[PDB]
Write an enzyme that holds these catalytic residues in place. Structure first.
Site, mmCIF file in Angstrom:
data_model
loop_
_atom_site.group_PDB
_atom_site.id
_atom_site.type_symbol
_atom_site.label_atom_id
_atom_site.label_comp_id
_atom_site.label_asym_id
_atom_site.label_seq_id
_atom_site.Cartn_x
_atom_site.Cartn_y
_atom_site.Cartn_z
ATOM 1 N N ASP A 290 0.788 -1.224 0.000
ATOM 2 C CA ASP A 290 0.000 0.000 0.000
ATOM 3 C C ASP A 290 0.826 1.284 0.000
ATOM 4 O O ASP A 290 0.426 2.294 -0.580
ATOM 5 C CB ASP A 290 -0.963 -0.008 1.190
ATOM 6 C CG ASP A 290 -1.931 -1.182 1.155
ATOM 7 O OD1 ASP A 290 -1.490 -2.340 0.962
ATOM 8 O OD2 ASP A 290 -3.140 -0.945 1.338
ATOM 9 N N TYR A 374 -9.673 -1.699 1.546
ATOM 10 C CA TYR A 374 -9.325 -1.310 2.928
ATOM 11 C C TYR A 374 -9.215 0.178 3.131
ATOM 12 O O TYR A 374 -8.939 0.944 2.209
ATOM 13 C CB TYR A 374 -7.890 -1.804 3.298
#
Ligand code: NI
Ligand code: NI
EC number: 1.4.3.21
Lengths: 620, 620
Positions: A290, A374
């Site tokens: 990420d 997420y």
């Protein structure tokens, strides 16, 4: 004024001009990464030399370049061409997200797969995911994205509720070719919806929650000057923001009476990886970095007052560059406030008749980011007693799959036919240590049990042992919760009044580290995650645990390479890299939307002060 | 009313009257312990039967008695005379504390020791400490307290700053004899004071902290009925209070729609030991079972509004018995309130355009106790998502000693000449499980790493494994932070919609357990502390991990004896005993007064619900 201030819109624009002018910026050139550079540890240095580093991608297929600009001077300092097959691909561009769906929508193989499942292609969402590096020789040098499909029954429908298992596509986003479409078999597409705002699912909302009002009638006790410089309860620091790391903390220091004592030079979450443990070829390549591949800072949410941050909030709205060098502001992207933290110290003494109680407080610096399914909140806390803490909060919607008929050892059922593959969320906090200055060292402290016998006749004795990590080849440490293992960073040339080197102790949560087989690709690409703590000799080009170009990089990129230098870390300018994360086996309660799960670490003063630093806090 | 309501003053007076009437409470008798008993299992009894158990001490030296009375029926159910040398002495009486210093003030051995150190006896405080069980044969059967001296320079002085090392005395508190005075040699008595309210030490107080006002305009969201029955955001429970255990939680249940689903029948901190690791004969006997020997509940502080409990607080003032059986109220001894807890769940979906954010909150039930130099806060939390958590907060003043000239492996320095012996603070949470009822089972869950090869070609797969603990013989478990070890408590007969047994997972902090050599007295007396988790078959007489009588009691009772029964725990009425604690190597920052240190555990729903139980949470 301060060389640590946040990047200005003006500075971003100027970087754009400078690039254009030197021909570095043009038609098929996209800015994959752009961020200010930290000062070079010099003395008076060159007054103020604001430099920016840019990663420039070429849409045509031409080689990308790493360029460092000087905005103060208006010059181009360097402009190297990158061999991506060697040094790895550039960060995924936000604009390449749609591309994977669009290209697949006309691919006959994709369409066939959808037709066999009776799926209307106009309803099939495709998640543009990183590809990593596996057995596909034709991918080296090419900028690949893999795709997994999710059915969206209507505009406001949650597609995560409808994964299309048994199918996966690989796409070359530069040459715009669907390099491959794999269909291992048809799996029923879960029918239940997961629309958490649909009153049919939520049920009647609660009417029981009464208001809790957190107000500061006289305002906050912290001051923000020079845009991002914070002064709060003896604490002093600068709040930075980088598109890749998100909120970064600079010059964390504590004013011990007269001396403004440095503690941490720079603290940041330098990497964040999410490895999946589903051995199905449909998902066995899935590992999202990420921070490294997607840049969590660009996806920071604009935090709403009252809902995201409650109480008296002071916001910072960082400015980033878009794909063309234009500045983009993330309004209310950072929350700054102080919150009550219960009891700090308390003693009701019989002999003296004195009853003493003091309350604690923590300064909070946070931001929330969204990367696909997420959402993550990054929180930094400074406490009255000198404790520094970081906490990551993981929410969002779980990444789904189909739940195998016959069960699974690597996937959990969330709803009928709906599965959630096992995974982890592993972070790396990069701590550029400055305990009372840069001359630091780290010791590993284990609790020591003693055997009953001479000198310990009652077998009650227990001690502690400390081992100094002297060379980098000995600074790759693992946790040992059993013996209460911690790591103390001290300045061997700055002693407290009891003549003991001042220090800070790092308390880890001792969660499991990377579970993947040591020989796996993810083990090699995310080697930082296989150990809890690494210590390196500072160097201005060792910024990330996985290296500068994570996207499709073969392996051993960062820490393992840096550590190979075996530099002297015993009483030098050092950096502590702490690996910490969550291991997830999703539960039924994580569906339709996940409640926050947390992880972190903290550092507490260990002989830094000469006595408690909170004796001067009033009763109030 | 509810058989779980708190004991009223009337009931305590009535227990006194019943004891008196029965010839059990003459003038030489003292109540060492008085507490109401929980209703029997199943409830096959017609109407209420409020029973109280009492430990009756005799100041003249007669054998003590254990008595259970039925206050409802005005009868004595049982009354047995106790052979204390065999089964243990009764808890230390509050009145015996002062006895130690006063008897020593006229002992010529004590006086000779003080004179040798030039100390004025009128300024020498004596900390009356539990004795434990060592090699002193003459102590078997007697009520002994050991004494360690601390100098108090003036009325408001903190004596802890002035420990008198090299000296310890043992006192039979019933016959009122000083049995022994041991002087190993003179040690400088630390001179520096530790007066945290002395402007000379504190320095001018901070004027920088601005107010943080936490209010509830419409009142709290929880309801208190029947004096101690709380209903909050689907949670339901009864807050009881025992003089030994302190706050005890009864009937913890969650309203899942129509049904009130049981989770935990009874939760309490059943024991807590504070062992010292200094092999000096002056302190090697030092171990305090604050719950079992002193009874933490009787020493609960009266909490001040705004100081101890900030916000909208609802107080409970529990009633206990004095040494004579008269009722004594602990004014505002329990704090009840709800507090904001950040973000509960959040997701900004690209595909849907739906941005969703919900805030968390927790119900807090707490009390603070003071036992000598230490003060402990006990906090229970109930979260919106079904999570249950306990947190202990350790503060007060460090127990001091002299710091040896040439340093120490078991003591740390806090000030010049001032030492702090190493120790631990270990707790035992007794959780009488009722996951959707009493038919429960416990499984130990370990993360499972998989080898790369057939079926896991990319070496990315990782699993989980669960082992059911079937008999008590296999229910004594240790932590394994490395493999993410947890323990799941399920009802093998209540399945969720996905046909899986409902459950709750216990997340431990994996802190070091008891460090003392296994062959030590403390290892035997605090056997429970040597392991992280124990599971027993419920029995109405298995209340504490150490037995009913801990004071001067050797091993032979408690968990190790219960476990030996090797009962069936696979789907039965079971109880989880979790050991968790702090290991302290005091730091200079801990002096003059300790900043709060914390430890705990939590239980999260694990397939208990059919989907997230917080979808009905509104905006906020
Ligand atoms: Ni997750
Ligand atoms: Ni302690």
């Amino acid at each position: 004024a301060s060389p640590f201030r946040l990047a200005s819109a003006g500075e971003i624009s100027e970087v754009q001009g400078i690039l254009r002018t030197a021909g570095l910026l043009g038609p098929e050139k996209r800015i994959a990464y752009l961020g200010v550079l930290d000062p070079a540890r010099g003395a008076g240095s060159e007054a103020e030399d604001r430099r920016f580093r840019v990663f420039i991608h070429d849409v045509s297929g031409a080689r990308p370049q790493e360029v460092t600009v000087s905005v103060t001077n208006g010059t181009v300092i360097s402009a190297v061409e990158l061999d991506t097959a060697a040094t790895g691909e550039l960060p995924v561009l936000e604009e390449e997200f749609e591309v994977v769906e669009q290209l697949l929508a006309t691919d006959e193989r994709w369409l066939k797969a959808l037709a066999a499942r009776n799926l209307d292609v106009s309803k099939v969402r495709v998640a543009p995911l990183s590809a990593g590096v596996f057995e596909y020789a034709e991918e080296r040098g090419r900028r690949i994205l893999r795709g997994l499909a999710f059915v969206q029954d209507f505009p406001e429908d949650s597609a995560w509720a409808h994964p299309v298992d048994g199918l996966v596509a690989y796409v070359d986003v530069v040459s715009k070719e669907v390099t491959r479409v794999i269909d291992t078999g048809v799996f029923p597409v879960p029918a239940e919806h997961g629309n958490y705002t649909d009153p049919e699912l939520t049920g009647p909302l609660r009417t029981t929650q009464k208001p809790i009002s957190i107000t500061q009638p006289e305002g906050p006790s912290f001051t923000v000057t020079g845009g991002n410089h914070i002064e709060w309860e003896k604490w002093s620091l600068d709040v930075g923001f980088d598109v890749r790391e998100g909120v970064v903390l600079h010059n964390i220091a504590f004013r011990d009476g007269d001396r403004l004592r440095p503690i941490i030079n720079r603290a940041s979450i330098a990497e964040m990886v999410v490895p999946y443990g589903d051995p199905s070829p449909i998902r066995s390549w899935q590992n999202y970095f990420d921070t490294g591949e997607y840049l969590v800072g660009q996806y920071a949410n604009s935090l709403e007052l009252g809902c995201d941050c409650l109480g008296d909030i002071t916001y910072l709205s960082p400015v980033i560059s878009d794909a063309f060098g234009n500045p983009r502001e993330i309004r209310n992207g950072i929350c700054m406030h102080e919150e009550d933290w219960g009891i700090l110290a308390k003693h009701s003494d019989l002999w003296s008749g004195i009853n003493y109680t003091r309350r604690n407080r923590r300064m909070v610096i946070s931001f929330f980011t969204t990367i696909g399914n997420y959402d993550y909140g990054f929180y930094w806390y400074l406490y009255l007693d000198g404790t520094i803490e970081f906490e990551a909060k993981a929410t969002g919607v779980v990444f789904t799959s189909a739940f195998p008929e016959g069960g699974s050892d690597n996937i959990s059922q969330l709803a009928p036919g709906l599965g959630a593959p096992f995974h982890q969320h592993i972070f790396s906090a990069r701590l550029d240590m400055a305990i009372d200055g840069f001359t630091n060292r780290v010791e590993e402290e284990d609790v020591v049990r003693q055997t009953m016998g001479p000198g310990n006749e009652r077998g009650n004795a227990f001690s502690r042992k400390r081992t100094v990590l002297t060379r980098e080849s000995e600074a790759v440490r693992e946790a040992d919760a059993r013996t209460g293992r911690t790591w103390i960073i001290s300045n061997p040339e700055s002693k407290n009044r009891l003549n003991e080197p001042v220090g800070y102790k790092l308390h880890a949560h001792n969660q499991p580290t990377l579970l993947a087989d040591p020989g796996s690709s993810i083990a090699r690409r995310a080697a930082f995650a296989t150990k809890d703590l690494w210590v390196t000799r500072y160097a201005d080009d060792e910024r990330y645990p996985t290296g500068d170009f994570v996207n499709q990089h073969s392996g051993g990129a960062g820490l393992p390479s840096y550590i190979a230098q075996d530099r002297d870390i015993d009483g030098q300018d050092i950096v502590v890299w702490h690996t910490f994360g969550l291991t997830h086996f999703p539960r039924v309660e994580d569906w339709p939307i996940m409640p926050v799960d947390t992880v972190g670490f903290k550092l507490r003063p260990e002989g830094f002060f000469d006595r408690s630093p909170v004796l001067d806090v009033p009763a109030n």
